[model samples]
Target: YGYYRTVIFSAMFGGYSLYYFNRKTFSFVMPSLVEEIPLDKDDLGFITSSQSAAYAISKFVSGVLSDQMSARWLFSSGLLLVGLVNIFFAWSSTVPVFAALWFLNGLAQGLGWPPCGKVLRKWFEPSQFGTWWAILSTSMNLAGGLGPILATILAQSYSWRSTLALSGALCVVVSFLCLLLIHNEPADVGLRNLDPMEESTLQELLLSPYLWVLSTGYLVVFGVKTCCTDWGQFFLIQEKGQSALVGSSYMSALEVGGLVGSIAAGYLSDRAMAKAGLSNYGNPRHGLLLFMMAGMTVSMYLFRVTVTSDSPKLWILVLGAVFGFSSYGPIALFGVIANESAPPNLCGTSHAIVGLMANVGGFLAGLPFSTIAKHYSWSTAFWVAEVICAASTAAFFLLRNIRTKMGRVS
Candidate 1:
């Protein structure tokens, strides 16, 4: 049983990592798309926005369906469709055509996470879930960080289309691996289900107010996260006096920090629970998460106050890492908190609601914050990140109080 569970974990880690490959290739491809083709920022924005909108909808809908569907079929087939969409997207240059294809890609993109939520809850014990989930969560960071390099190389070596074709082809291979190796739960192999579970109705989920509160936690996490990941580079160039290439090199530490932070936050929080004899319902995860939230806020402040053009280049890397590290810990916990706070059966929907809110927060944070930096000052934008961090940390605090006083484990 343990052996098979390890196999499932491995497959999922690789499976989800590859899911992120095509997701990011477009950003790398955009400049090339404009240089070689007739597309402009307006057309690119439409195509990208179409993908994000569809992705958000699919995440919620797929969360409901992931509970009922076979993990193997849902993930494998969704991956295949994304691959096909990427291939088609490579050949298309027209606005509406790319928009439609990217929208389909976004829809399929939603298929990746809900199954992981279900599988983690079913295959791993709650005591260890945070660590394992956190481990798996880094797959996105690792792949997202490396994917640009691969896309950039392929785009330069041939054309923008070549990058898309190679990424699509790679995804197709990973899809096959997922289909061959993954199991939905331990019961699929003649073992007992990790814990006997009941299905949760949509009505039951809707009735639970805890669901909405935690969903807002995700909202705040991404609102703050969008600051570092999306706009940190521009801040580096304009405010810190670093060259763009140097800024990018320093920014690479964000992924490394995220990788470390995810594992540490998950593992440490689980240890806190075990030591205190608290269950997920008893709210063990939030104490350390509050600290991480503080770290995120402090790190952002340091970037503005301590980091300057005369500062060591390594300081930029370290601070960037610090920002990534602090922010990702809570981001990692969002899934663990949702999955544990609800019944096992609601795992996907629980995660889906939070994930969907994550999209909303991320989207809300994007355009306005950038405008502030462009129109006002990066200093003002940093204040926005701090404000959102404060709001998100407040949510974590409220989440801790909302959990019951008595400890219970599934």
Candidate 2:
């Protein structure tokens, strides 16, 4: 049973890792698609956005079922759905069909995140939650970085289709691994239940009005991070005249910064909360997120405000790294906030709902950037993104006040 739980956790992580694997495949594959298949930014935007659309809708639904039903089924089934669909994606040669297939894959991908949140909520104690969440969330970023890099390598040697096909195959294999290995509750596996103290704690969380406010704040946090990560590389390559290889390097730096920032923030929050005696509710560390988002906005402006005609490749890359560090607050903590925002009993639902909103931010980040870039220029898109991040930062502070009133901290 202990072995089963470990296997489930590992398989879920791998399966979700594939969701991201497909999510980011186009970043590397896009150039090749444009060259061979005749597509454009808008087309790429649609492809990326399709996943977001599916993910946005599926997140809450999946989250609800993840808690109420079998985590094993919700978790494993989506893998099969996406894997088979993604294999079809490998065959897509035209724009319309490609967009449709990608969208289906995106919907299938939505089944990934919320179930993991549900799993975490069931098994982990709140006090230790942040650390585990941080570690698990990093899988997505790791896959995000590795996805593009792998695709680039594979496509260069084989073909983009071959790379997609290989990724699809991996998804199927991992799904079967999950079906065999993964189980839902600690009880099913004969582990002990969550701490009894969490029951009243969950009660307080449900009644608090601050929970809603914090959940909304999470939307912006994830939204801006997604926008920057998805669009930043494209801006660097096309608008700034950096080579694709150089752009990927800048993006990789951003991912590295994110990994470091996530680990640091979670550990810091846990420590700070422990010291402050506010472990039952979140620590006053929520206030710190506002600063991080604010810093991210500034970095976005610096990277965005550069001259289109000037050769500032090094500066852009440097600024991308800076933006990455600042940006981690939202992506890393949005779900953390969501996991903690609701009544403990409803933790899975809260996370699923909040996760849905976060993906909406991610989806909008993909589509609007193309249109925004087309009309006003890529700088306009970045400027808009900066404004969104700034607003999100301010909103997070407002939510902090709400938390205070609800007695998160004095």
Candidate 3:
């Protein structure tokens, strides 16, 4: 059981990392796309927004499918579709065509995470989920960081088209590995379900206001994250007068910091819960969320200052990392919170619902946030993000109080 557990974890880590490569290749290619293609800023924004819209819808749908189907195949097929669409995306030049292809890719992207969520719930005990989930979440930062560098290097050497085509091919290879290694449940490996538990009723889930509040919290927290991840480079170049390479490095620094922050947050969440005698997997208090969000709010405001100042590039990089470190803690742990609150049977759906909210937030961050940056200024746009972080802190505080009053998990 232990050996297979290790194998599954390793495969999932690598598989999802490759998924990030396919998903993020477009962002790295955005600047080149503007230069090589005939699209305007708004057109590019529409394409991104379209993809997010599709991705958000698909996550909700796939969350249900993931619970009902074989995750191994579902995950592998999703990768395969994304890879094929990316290849097609390379060949498209028109705005509408690009949007259509990416929307299809977005549909495929939904397949990436829900299956992993379902698998994790089945394998790890709830109490330990924070640690494991946090570690697994870093695959996003690690791969997201590497994906930009790799895509840019390829774009420089060959062309942006070559970058997409090659990255697509790589995704196909990882898809096969996923099929080989990822089993839907431990029952396939002669072990019992780690979380044999009751299903959450639709009425119960709907009546429970906790899910809605938590979903809103995810929206605010992940919306800020999406803004930072997608626009950080653009902000650096436009406001800080940094070169494109330097901006890319700043984005990478953010991801690296996210990696460290996620691991630490997981450990801290688990420790805090254990101390409170709530050592269940997803039962950590709002303590860590409060602490992290407070730090994030300060760092986000400071990031704007550092960008506008004559401070050394190193200072800006450090501040970016600080912001990343602070923001990702809640982003990484929210799933555990949802899982712990919802019935074990609805784990996939519960996660998907929160993810849907987050993606809606991400979808807004694309065009709407870009419009703010363009019409106003990067600092103004980022100040809005800081405000969102402050709002999220308030949401978490409210949630903590509700949990205390109810004396029950969601």
Candidate 4:
């Protein structure tokens, strides 16, 4: 069991890392696109929002489909499609063309995570799921950090188009490797599924108030997080007058912060739960979320205030890392909360429901939020995100109240 867990972890981690590589290629190339292409910021906003819309819908549907389909095939197919779309995206120069291809890529990117969630649940026990999940979740931050550096180097040496094509080519190779490497369960290795669960009715699961509360909190959390991750580089370059490479390095700092934050959050949340004699989905995690959200609110304010033309770059970097560190804890742990809130059978669906809301945040943050930045200032955008952070903190406390009233932990 131990050896098999290590193998699955390594394979899934590598596969998901490549997913980030392909997904973030656009973000890294945005500055180059602005210079070489004739699109405005609003057009770029629309492109990102369209992708989010597709990704949101696809993720919800894929969660349901993954329950009935082969995880191995589903994941690899999505990666393959994302790769092909990137190649197509590299060839296009028009807003409509970019929108269409990116939307398709969004659908494909949606295919990557839910199955990974499903597989992780199969391999690990509930007691240790958070730790394993945090470790796996760091792949996003890891690849996010590495992707920009890779894309920036490629863009500097060749062209943005070349960067996209090369990234797509790498995705193609990983897709094949995933098909060869990933397995649906320990059953393939002469072991039983570690966490077999009875069937759960989707209706009852969907109707739970716990699901709604978690979903709403996640919506706000991911909205603020995505706004920063997707647009931070643009903010640095346009508002602070930093060069592209410098802006990307700051973005990498944000991801590196996330990498460290997630691992710490996972271990701390697990210990906190144990110390309180609470379930995985109970007060400890909620309390931690409140602390993290408050930190996010403060750190993001500092991040916005410090990234100025005259402000020292070190301050901006420190604040950016602080904000990312605070924000990603919730992003990585929310799935564990969702899983514990519902029956094991509904793990994928519950997380998918919350994930749907999270991407709604992504969709709105892209166009509508960018419009606010365009009309007002970059600080305006961070101000709005700060409000959302406060709101999410409030939601977590309210959720705590509800749990207390019910005299139940999950």
TM agreement with the true structure for every prediction: 0.83, 0.73, 0.76, 0.74
User: Candidate 2 on 161-249: residue-level lDDT in tens?
Assistant: 78878877988888888888766677776677766432334445456666566656766767777777777667777766767877777
Q: Write the per-residue lDDT of candidate 1 for residues 351-407, one digit (tens) a residue.
A: 776777887787788788878888989888888778777776766676666543212
Clashes of each: 0, 1, 2, 0
Per-residue CA lDDT of model 3 for 1-410, tens digit only, reads 68887999999998888888778778878778777766677987898888888877887899888767877899899989988998898888777898899889888888988788778877887567788887887787677657767666777888787778877887888888788888777778777765443345666666666778788888888888888888888777766777886777787788778778888888988777666764233345577878888988888877776456366879878987888888777887777788766666566767777877886787778889989888988889888788877876876676574532111344
Best by TM-score: 1
**Candidate 4 — what's its lDDT?**
0.78
lDDT of 4 at 174: 85
Candidate 4 C-alpha lDDT tens digits along 106-216? 888879887888887777775677888888877886786577777777778888877788778988898898888887878887886654323557765555676677778
| Model 2 misplaced stretches (Cα beyond 4 Å) | 1-6, 26-49, 90-97, 152-166, 198-208, 219-253, 274-284, 294-322, 359-410
lDDT winner, 2 or 4: 4
User: Which of the predicted structures, 1 or 4, would earn the higher lDDT when compared with the native?
Assistant: 1
In order, the Cα lDDT scores of the candidates are 0.78, 0.70, 0.78, 0.78
21 Cα displacement, candidate 4 (Å): 1.7
Query: Which window of 10 residues has the lowest lDDT sum in candidate 1?
Result: 401-410
